[PDB]
């Protein structure tokens, strides 16, 4: 989450859609309420296992799981799925703004502070298409997502 940009709202360029910051919030019906893995046991007899992380308020649906073929331990797998369930609900918000080539040193993977009148929410950026007007599809990223979960082991 190490912020490189610090844009104010006054410092965005004039976009294509003639909105300084188009902000999309994704659907509640698709937020991945519970996430799953298919890691490999990596300590014992190497076997396919699964852990899941369940968000306490909305556990009513949206199971979204994936399968990773690598091998990792038991507290680490619950750490990863604990990280995705936090991130996939953080990454609901996406921003679609344009910033001028006066500051073109915002590389395609940097993260923008983006001061607003209401919020001051960070945004990591994707899909930079410039042609002399850097237009950005950002996505909401918080710093505290990328931490150890500090869980006990098996």
């Amino acid at each position: 989450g190490r912020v490189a940009a610090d844009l104010a709202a006054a410092d965005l360029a004039l976009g294509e859609g003639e909105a300084v910051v188009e902000t999309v919030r994704a659907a509640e019906a698709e937020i991945a309420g519970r996430v799953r893995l298919a890691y490999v046991e990596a300590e014992g007899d190497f076997e396919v296992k699964a852990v899941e992380a369940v968000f306490p308020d909305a556990a009513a649906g949206a199971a979204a799981g994936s399968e990773l073929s690598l091998a990792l331990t038991r507290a680490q797998a619950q750490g990863i799925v604990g990280r995705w369930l936090a991130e996939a609900r953080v990454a609901r918000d996406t921003a679609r703004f344009a910033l001028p080539p006066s500051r073109g040193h915002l590389g395609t993977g940097d993260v923008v502070r983006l001061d607003l009148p209401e919020g001051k929410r960070r945004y990591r950026i994707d899909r930079v298409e410039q042609a002399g007007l850097i237009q950005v599809e950002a996505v909401r990223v918080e710093p505290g997502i990328y931490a150890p979960a500090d869980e006990v082991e098996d």
Binding site: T108, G109, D126, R127, V128, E129, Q130, A131
Partner: peptide, 10 residues
């Protein structure tokens, strides 16, 4: 003519 370099973290 240099038309519109695009990018992606992907």
């Amino acid at each position: 003519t240099a038309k519109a370099v695009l990018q992606g973290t992907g």
